[model samples]
Target chain A: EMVETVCGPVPVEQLGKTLIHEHFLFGYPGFQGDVTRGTFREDESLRVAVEAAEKMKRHGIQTVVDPTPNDCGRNPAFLRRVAEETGLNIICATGYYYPPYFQFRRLLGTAEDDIYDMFMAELTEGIADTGIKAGVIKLASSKGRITEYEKMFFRAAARAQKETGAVIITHTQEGTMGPEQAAYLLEHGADPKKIVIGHMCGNTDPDYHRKTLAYGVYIAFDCFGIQGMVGAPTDEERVRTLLALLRDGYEKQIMLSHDTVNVWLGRPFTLPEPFAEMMKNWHVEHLFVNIIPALKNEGIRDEVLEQMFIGNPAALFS
Target chain B: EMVETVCGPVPVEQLGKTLIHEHFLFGYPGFQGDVTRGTFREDESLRVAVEAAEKMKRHGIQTVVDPTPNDCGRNPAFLRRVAEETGLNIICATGYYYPPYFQFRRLLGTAEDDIYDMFMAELTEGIADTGIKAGVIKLASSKGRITEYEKMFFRAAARAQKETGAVIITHTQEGTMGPEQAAYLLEHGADPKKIVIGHMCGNTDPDYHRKTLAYGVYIAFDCFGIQGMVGAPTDEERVRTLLALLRDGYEKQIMLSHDTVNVWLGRPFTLPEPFAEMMKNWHVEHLFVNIIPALKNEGIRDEVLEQMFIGNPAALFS
Candidate 1:
């Protein structure tokens, strides 16, 4: 089956050297107390995003999967522009993120089926006249624990996964909850192989990583280049962890991305000051510009890199 | 019946010389393309609101109804302080105003019942555990037309109004759609006098205003003192139209206020330059300091003014 993209559908085989989890545009849902509710500047964002994505294109990237949830300021129009400018396949995800407080928890009438229906309609019917379908289902849990409202999202996502064969991706808080997320989604009739647990690199604990990966789900050492996060693994630690996993022949069980938003929703349409300060190498091309060369220097083979970059993504979406 | 104020409850009789549709604090919802999704500056807001409300208090205003909807940056906690500072009853609303493009339109799964449950809960249970119950249900129609989504909100507000004996206020774009709104809610079992058709002064057509007020619903010349709105009635037109209604012994079916936000939400927590310019004389004291005097010179009697300000509001909420 083909992977549906914002512009249209693309054959899975054509999704080359893909960054499995990333964002072209992201605004934390303003429903929660995200006071920086800003608009994206179309001309400037199109210019800057094209520049960043072109760097990745030069580094042999063909696709970037933006698993930006609908509530998290996902803009299909902006993404489509990025795809056009860079000649990259930019795929968007549909669903909700784990906001600090879930307004939709009560909004969908407290029934889990309503959320399932929402995702199903989004995936199958397209997102409200945009005529652009979601390639994946996005969900998340808060720090260290999944709230009842978040659990409802996971349960509904599982059904969407089962019905639509849509790959499910999630955000883990402070590097924790990855294991439970995998088990929770997979245990509820979701295919293990089609599930992706995001932000594992938010931790350096190998035991936790292995346990989360043990669910036969893909794990993303995704949040590279953001240094000094308390529970999150530094780029050095993430690279070290990946090399070890590569040596253990878990190449196909892994994926990579900067998980950085190229154009965001907020003041000046850029990252907030703290994010700007913390992010050293966070860009659409970070995986290619810094991380891949670092991995190659550590004696990871071309074939293994190909599997991580291309083959695993195809398998998950297909 | 007691009026549930932003601070607490006040007897309807104590609501002396009330401005039935004014705002001590208001912000257009972040959904309406506010890029600087900024937070309200509580300290600054309290300062501005106190300053504004105090002037009105000196002019014998004892209560100010803030018909700002929940989605529209309705700050109850902040309003409570302004009420205390002015020694006035400041009323806050429970429901949502019509967003330019309805975000909750598709999000709520298209069930009208879901919206009903939400407003009902807010009316009975209070909002987000702030223990501040909503005094009114705020709603709107766009460009003289209510979409399917807007209809859901109306139906919900009608039910809430019926069950809770709450007042329902609305935004009528350019004084249009008031008839349809009055008919719609009234047919759905809402008390006619308890529902207000806002922005009638936005148009000067006597026949249109009369036809709308003929629904047994209260009419609001709420956009007082903010002049020169294109296609909308100027202060002359509004005051002339208001005089015509007052002359016709329709004071019991009328309410007055500036509908001006004393404090607002934004990046810098202030009005944008254009708003600052266009909103000349748009203040809490405009009614007492300027409009009342203007009406008095125009031969509108003080007792008729009392009926509009004091008596009508008491009957509406009580």
Candidate 2:
């Protein structure tokens, strides 16, 4: 089996040490309005992204999956340039964000079938004639449950997943809807093996992890090294929970990532004090440099780490 | 005094025979997702836009105001190219669209002050360092009344208008909220001369026109030639209402245009039967070829036509 990348498709065996949920470039849906204040500069963003990707390469990382949905400045063309420069196997996504972001389409009365066609086209043909196929589908739910508006997207994504055989990764806000999301996608026809419930670290309870995992979907602790933000667990807290899950024999069903934003598209607003201190380790390199080493000190064997990082990703893609 | 065009600033007097509310290119907020279906071809759009602009010049239009808000695929660089190629003055805008569109920012907890600063920066400094200053500020309200989320945008726009001395144009959905929009903007400190209540033709009630016009603001029958759509009055109905307003001596407070879209971003869906027929005359040249002549045949003189088309626009800018 082959996995799609921004540059082209690659053999599933080539997907080694992948960070499955990250954003190379991201902004909220309305960030384009900030253009007047000079938020994003193409040359500067290109330079910054290439430099970051080069560092990831030096850290022995082989692949990075960028799930920035279509509305949130998903620039596959830019990713292609970055992949070419750093030789990184970068994957892009085709989906919309949740809440007020999805509200735009809802008010327009966009039908579910149209959305399904969009996802299917991106998976099969390419994104906008750029010939960049997305390897995975993305879906999201509001806090605590699936909304009526969001249900349409989830249904559409489910249909696309069944048809294209692309994996569906999801955003469960503040870790509130993992089990609900997993159940909905499955009931709507998605394969549990091809579904990843993301942002699992936002919840601290082992029971919550077990409940979501009981549904047979892969759960991703993708927001690693992001500390002290409300609703976000610190790297240390995440490690403890992840270690517990591993001891409980959940390693084969978990994915790891920092969900780091390599480039922000709007004006850089200063975060409050502790968040700045908290985010010091939040970057694309957090998993390879800090989290893995800390996990090793906790006596996580290299083989299991390999399973979580390399083997699981390959299995999911295949 | 100067008016900003995508090409650069022009003397206010040079903005002759202008269309005050229109879109050179437009799509709802999430249209970018439709890219996989082969929407928004840049080369084709450029060709279409320049061709349309050349025809507008031949029809005696000197300026076109494109009130495509920031989130609605507003591309000033593309407008500049069209202006350069056709030697037509194209004015771009800096604002967000209504309702669910503005909901994206509100949910993000964006402050009103930040929105005001964004509007001010675009009016003075230019959009995204492209050095293409906006000639006007655009704002919109939902059906019948302004929501609390929309109130923040209006308040911010009022502040920006007060600070920068730029005109504020508004979208009143289906012709509702015209008087309410006028009253709220005036109460919030926007100059009466600088406010335009757009889409006045959506309402067939002359009393509604009289009430909105009584606020001493321009009311635009900008959807001229857009007939038979729900809430959209036919050209004949629009001309009759406009003539009545003229006889009521509100000539200085009226604007006209087709609100024609030169380029649509997404995959073009075929309109239903009547809509295709209804939209036959809905192009940039509709006013010069059809509406103006229809009005002339109704005994309205050249100078009043000149006043509505030329003098009022100059007055708004200056």
Candidate with top TM-score is 2
Across A149-185, the per-residue lDDT of candidate 1 in tens digits comes to 8888899999888888888888898988999999888
- TM, every model: 0.55, 0.89
Candidate 2 residues lying further than 4 Å off, grouped into runs, are A54-59, A99-110, A233-240, A288-302, B99-110, B228-244, B288-302
The 10-residue segment with the lowest total lDDT in model 1 chain B: B30-39
Model 1's DockQ score: 0.03
B189-218 per-residue lDDT for model 1 (tens digits):
999979889988887889898889889999
Best by lDDT: 2
The true-versus-predicted C-alpha distance at residue B16 of model 1, in Å, is 1.0
Error of 2 at B57 (Å): 3.8
Question: Tens digit of lDDT per residue, candidate 2, span B1-318?
Answer: 998899888999888888887787888766765667637688889999999888888978889999998878899999999999888998888788783333544544666877888888889988886889898889988888798878998999999998989989999888799999999999999999988899999998899999998899998899987876646777888888998999988889998988888888666655567678878998888898788888888898999988988999999989
Residue A76 deviation, candidate 1, in Å? 22
The alpha-carbon deviation from the true structure for residue B199 of candidate 2, after best TM-score superposition, in angstroms, is: 1.5
